[PDB]
A paper describes a structure:
In this context, Trametes multicolor [name] (TmP2O; EC 1.1.3.10; for a review, see) is of interest since it can oxidize both β-D-Glc and β-D-Gal to the corresponding 2-keto sugars, which are intermediates for production of D-fructose and D-tagatose. TmP2O is a homotetrameric enzyme produced by lignocellulolytic fungi and has been assigned a role in lignin degradation. The reaction catalyzed by TmP2O is of the ping-pong type involving a reductive and an oxidative half-reaction. Therefore, to evaluate and compare the productive and competing sugar-binding modes for oxidation of Glc and Gal, we used crystal-structure analysis of 2- and 3-fluorinated Glc and Gal derivatives bound to the TmP2O variants H167A, [name], [name] and [name]/[name].
The [name]/[name] variant combines the two mutations [name] and [name], which individually promotes Gal turnover. However, the overall Glc-to-Gal selectivity ratio for the [name] mutant was increased relative to the wild type. By combining the two aforementioned mutations, [name] and [name], a third enzyme variant was investigated that showed increased Gal conversion and decreased turnover of Glc accompanied by slightly increased binding constants for both substrates, leading to a Glc-to-Gal selectivity ratio that was decreased relative the wild type, but higher than for [name]. At the structural level, we define the productive binding mode for Glc according to three main criteria: (i) the sugar is oriented for oxidation at C2; (ii) the substrate-binding loop is in the semi-open conformation; and (iii) the side chain Oγ1 group of Thr169 is pointing away from the flavin N(5)/O(4) locus, i.e., it does not form hydrogen bonds with either N(5) or O(4). In the [name]/[name] mutant, the selectivity ratio with O2 as electron acceptor shows a 27-fold preference of Glc over Gal.
Author numbering:
A (entry chain A), B (entry chain B): 43 to 618
C (entry chain A): 92 to 181
D (entry chain A): 454 to 543
């Protein structure tokens, strides 16, 4: 560890690693700090689901997720426990228990909001779904020129997609995937298009997908090394970044105050360029700790001078969920090309197809897989092979269906894992809404309570807006009920429901992007630079100022690439 | 990865790590293979609970545990789901689903039994409780000389305790720990002693304990290196070990069959010495897959010729659990030295005590801690400080109370963490019973069903022996109800219950030790050498042939230490 | 029709459940493996609790039930009395 | 006839129930029979069902019915947690 780098990056998630990739590559002296630690194995910041053991027990990985989602603001509990023994100590009031947040209104919270503090952040557990936003969901990068704005986004997404190894072909050979994808394509003929979810992942075998992460973007090894002898990069885990120090003029950052968690010592680090990519919650916390915006419960009598839109216009997506059990008709359509005779397990039992026949509904690879499973496992009443991969289906956001969809099997299950129904039959449904940015919807930080790292306690003041947001959220719910029904009836224990506000972890707009700080009520410009500040940049979904339903990360990355370009154009690397 | 090694060790758990420490240190060329992969961070095989994040968020670690406990034998499920939509495909029978084990009788199972496949094994998540066994639970290392037996065990235990860094004072400054322990010793009026659970751990600060693990025993770094230039060690993760090749006379092992899970390739690896430390389940599986004992459902009247006691006499402990809410009486006593005036939160309120007053029931440092908490947080109605450590109390197994006890807070929570009751009030109780070895209690492996790694499927045939084991189990439950009531009544939602059989993961006796293969119905001698084989040693809790209630790992390690002494006496390390 | 139920409509679910006796309960196959070791424990899923060994659990009307009180089920019914249109009607 | 524990955290004035009922095609395979060995509590032959909702129009309509309740109920408000759309026991 030196005291002077060219660039300091706060956060080793995939957005901090986008900045590391671009700047370590362009030959800057780069430092990166994460409050969390290295755990994912020898590949630093890698996806935790890439072990052989998880690929053979996909059902277990829900635990890894839950292990690293630390709630952001837990309100005070008011459940009444009146079956305590008379000898047991019993409250007189509903006092602040268990580090809960006294500032938090329970009825205006994002209870499901949570943060991950591990090297590689949330990209160590994420689903890897990486769709682009269409214009309606998307911030403008060029005004008064739609083709040029389209042009700019298409170049940035293509590069981002490249970093993530995004693709749409990894599940092309799955029976469940094709079955579900097929039905939907037919039921919505002329109304909606379906495709495989664009996934940041590369298939290595029929039973192993290598999921992308921050590690895929930047491998997080210290440089130089044999492989990159001309590069300079250091990662510093177990270091809390607490403040960036403003000059009085509010035109530069002077240093980064860090707290080393192992030794306990606090240090000041100098950079030319300061990049904050600590997540949509923790960027904002860090800026408010540094004198931006306002600390404490909002006071509209006294709005802040510096960055007054900070932690206002926050957006979170509504999320609906269910599971279905495959319809008998769909199960039967799996074997529509077969001539089946006799009874399974009985001497006369016969399953045949004509390869290549004109009347066939399925390709041969399909019918070969089904015929062999049906003949070789006559104890099993289904035509789907045991290790057939799950579906990965979406119909993407459009004006007539303004929500994102994911259909398949997500590793983030929400209830106890049920065993009485065959997993081959189960399909998950997650629809995500777009939330209108409104000034009243706030992420603020307490001037009295602190969190576990002795930083001001995050508090939400949030309701989904009563108008179009709420109407769309309910229409979205009905749409999932309508659509899922095409595949099968609901699985009991996983009936259609809205998830806890924020469980979906797509918070944006906490440090929002736009052209003009005042006119567009924002905090950063289109180079991701904090207005007024020559050398302070924010990356992540906190930048995204629009109402979006699709998963944000690729859009964030896309903004971070544009932001690296401005840095390469305006700061010179130190000579070796 | 070479053709040939002095020693190969299967399994990188703490026991395999005991062999690596001893044999690498003694100059042998050591290879160690683990089916799982590196995932504890840069300290290979280290406890996953040693992150700052987990020590600030101890309730989340239950998820890390659950994520890596993969159930051993799951029977076929027979739950009726009759609220499916009429359109959903519906079972006509309870067919084999979701990888269940059709050999498994659901009513003679250890359903809670589970395995961990990661480098460092279960030591990456364990509670680090390392009690010694008293004579009554301890297998003999010397017959007919209780003095030499004792001194042998004292010496092996003292060594294992330093390897693990066991100690008994890391929690001595907790108010809760002391409140609970003092009240118990008062109430038992001499009949039983309460102490700190001996813990493999080192305290680093008032808020961080470096838990021990495999890595504390042996750091698992490849060697030679700068810190050990004369040593020789390679770890090969993601390598499934499948067979040891016996010579036909059953007097030696010739090679070990391995499957490289990344490349898919298979190799036979040669060494002078072969050490199986794959766990109590997997050592037996590997051995059975190699022609020892009997593959398939046990057949009485066909008995195996080679190690006929392998997989018989299995033991698993009964585990009872509850939590309590601390008594008003105990909460009042924490503050018994205080003069308290006025009402909390008024300008009038004050809490004082006299330091050094001879009538004080508590030391100054306690009273200081209570005073500060009570004066600095007058919103809080409890006298216990916010990050006061949990209790870590035990009364150790004895003949008139033949079960091990642990009282405090265990990371491995068994239901949803409740938020209505303050955590400072909650104390956990786990009592562990001892199970008679009986021949009918079997771990065996299917000759038709295979597991996730294509190895014969583990199947249990187990009931708690009627008679002593079962009478003690129930007296144990009653003892927990009786003892726990001294501290507080039960916490609703954590009422006194037996846990699922084998949830406690203290399986023993699957490859058990004894003097004489026939007379003692066993598999390994007191050097942990498999009878008749020059160069095959088994390590782990599977060696332990006795009825025990204490946590078995320190004992298993002590035996390994004895086994390594045999090795250094009978194999020369190769020239460097 | 009592004053007390008209003032506590929420309670009347209990009167209903009190007089719906299941018609055919199949044999239970739930596995209770946290019984104490001293407690008597089945070796098989035998016919318990008057359940019906003849009943296929997967081809049942489990929710079917009968009321044996004077006035039968009309002592608790919802009183909804629509006519069938031709398509529903004999 | 409520089906789950009575919830109190939401005002009863806001709660609306939805029950949609399907028509079932009569099929010969769907039977109510009586055991010649087991008896019920009045020493009469034990009722046994052999029943599945017919795979064709009955089942299609039942699922369309479910979707119809989801579509229609939405006009009034969102689902109450603990009373999410579900098929009741047959
Ligand atoms: C957890 C989760 C997340 C996503 C999906 C599923 C689940 C279970 N699936 C997924 C997501 N997004 C996608 O677009 N597609 C989907 O398939 N999920 C969200 C996604 O995972 C995030 O949007 C993404 O990582 C955001 O990246 P980022 O902006 O780089 O932020 P991270 O949270 O990954 O990393 C931040 C980081 O910095 C640290 N930190 C925080 N505060 C500090 C301070 N004060 N000092 C130092 N370091 C700090 C963290 O520890 C962390 O590593
Ligand atoms: C999970 C757990 C277990 C312990 C406690 C708490 C919980 C939640 N706490 C506890 C324990 N015991 C104590 O003595 N005190 C306590 O506080 N727990 C049990 C303890 O953790 C085990 O007894 C101990 O690890 C056993 O050590 P081991 O004999 O070294 O075996 P492990 O299972 O840890 O490691 C085995 C290992 O080998 C692998 N494996 C399995 N099969 C193969 C094959 N075929 N090839 C290659 N490698 C194989 C594993 O992947 C593993 O790492
Ligand atoms: C319980 C229930 C029932 C109905 C609704 C709600 C609930 C909770 N709501 C309702 C109904 N039907 C409507 O059209 N609209 C709705 O709003 N429910 C059903 C309705 O309640 C029944 O369809 C109706 O009573 C049928 O009348 P029934 O054909 O007269 O049959 P009952 O079951 O009322 O009375 C039969 C009767 O005879 C007895 N019994 C049975 N076996 C014997 C023998 N062997 N010996 C002598 N007596 C016998 C009974 O004890 C009973 O009183
Ligand atoms: O709740 C899980 C969901 O979380 C979201 O963060 C992801 O973007 C989705 F892919 C995922 O299915
Ligand atoms: O189930 C958790 C328990 O599991 C056991 O393996 C441990 O030995 C105990 F320490 C622990 O409390």
């Amino acid at each position: 560890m030196d005291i002077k780098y060219d660039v300091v990056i706060v956060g080793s998630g995939p957005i901090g690693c986008t900045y590391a990739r671009e700047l370590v590559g362009a030959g800057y002296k780069v430092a990166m700090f994460d409050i969390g630690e290295i755990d994912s194995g020898l590949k630093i910041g890698a996806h935790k689901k890439n072990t052989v053991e998880y690929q053979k027990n996909i059902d277990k990985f829900v635990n890894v997720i839950q292990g690293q989602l630390m709630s952001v603001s837990v309100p005070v509990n008011t459940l009444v426990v009146d079956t305590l023994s008379p000898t047991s100590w019993q409250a007189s009031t509903f006092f602040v228990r268990n580090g809960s947040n006294p500032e938090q209104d329970p009825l205006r919270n994002l209870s499901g909001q949570a943060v991950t503090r591990v090297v590689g952040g949330m990209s160590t557990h994420w689903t890897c779904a990486t769709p682009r936003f269409d214009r309606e969901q998307r911030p403008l990068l060029v005004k008064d020129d739609a083709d040029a704005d389209d042009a700019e986004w298409d170049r940035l997404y293509t590069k981002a997609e490249s970093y993530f190894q995004t693709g749409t072909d990894q599940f092309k050979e799955s029976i469940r995937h094709n079955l579900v994808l097929n039905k939907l394509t037919e039921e919505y003929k002329g109304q909606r298009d379906f495709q495989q979810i664009p996934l940041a992942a590369t298939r290595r075998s029929p039973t192993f997908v290598e999921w992308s992460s921050a590690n895929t973007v930047f491998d997080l090894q210290n440089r130089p090394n044999t492989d990159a002898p001309e590069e300079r990069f250091n990662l510093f885990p177990a270091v809390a970044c607490e403040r960036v120090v403003r000059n009085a003029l509010n035109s530069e950052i002077e240093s980064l105050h860090i707290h080393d968690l192992i030794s306990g010592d606090r240090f000041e680090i100098k950079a030319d360029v300061y990049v904050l990519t600590a997540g949509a919650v923790h960027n904002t916390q860090l800026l408010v700790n540094s004198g931006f915006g306002q600390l404490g419960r909002p006071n509209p009598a006294n709005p802040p001078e510096l960055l007054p839109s900070l932690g206002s216009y926050i957006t979170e997506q509504s999320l609906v969920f269910c599971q279905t059990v495959m319809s008998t008709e769909l199960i039967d359509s799996v074997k529509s090309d077969m001539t089946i005779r006799g009874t399974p397990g009985e001497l006369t039992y016969s399953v045949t197809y004509t390869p290549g026949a004109s009347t066939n509904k399925h390709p041969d690879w399909w019918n070969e897989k089904v015929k062999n499973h049906m003949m070789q496992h006559q104890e099993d009443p289904l035509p789907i092979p045991f290790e057939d991969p799950e579906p990965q289906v979406t119909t993407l956001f459009q004006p007539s269906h303004p929500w994102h969809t994911q259909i398949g099997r997500d590793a983030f299950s929400y209830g106890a894992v049920q065993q009485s129904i065959d997993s081959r039959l189960i399909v998950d449904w997650r629809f995500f809404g777009r939330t209108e940015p409104k000034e009243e919807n706030k992420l603020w930080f307490s001037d009295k309570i602190t969190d576990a790292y002795n930083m001001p306690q995050p508090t939400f003041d949030f309701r989904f807006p009563a108008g179009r947001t709420s109407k769309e959220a309910e229409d979205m719910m009905t749409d999932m009920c309508v659509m899922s029904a095409k595949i099968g009836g609901f699985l009991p224990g996983s009936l259609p429901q809205f998830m806890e506000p924020g469980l979906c972890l797509h918070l944006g707009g906490t440090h929002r992007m736009g052209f003009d700080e005042k006119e567009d009520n924002c905090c950063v410009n289109t180079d991701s630079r904090v207005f007024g500040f020559k050398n302070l940049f924010l990356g992540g979904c906190g930048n995204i100022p629009t109402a979006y339903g699709a998963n944000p990360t690729l859009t964030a990355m896309s903004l971070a690439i544009k932001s690296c370009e401005y840095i390469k154009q305006n700061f010179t690397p130190s000579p070796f």
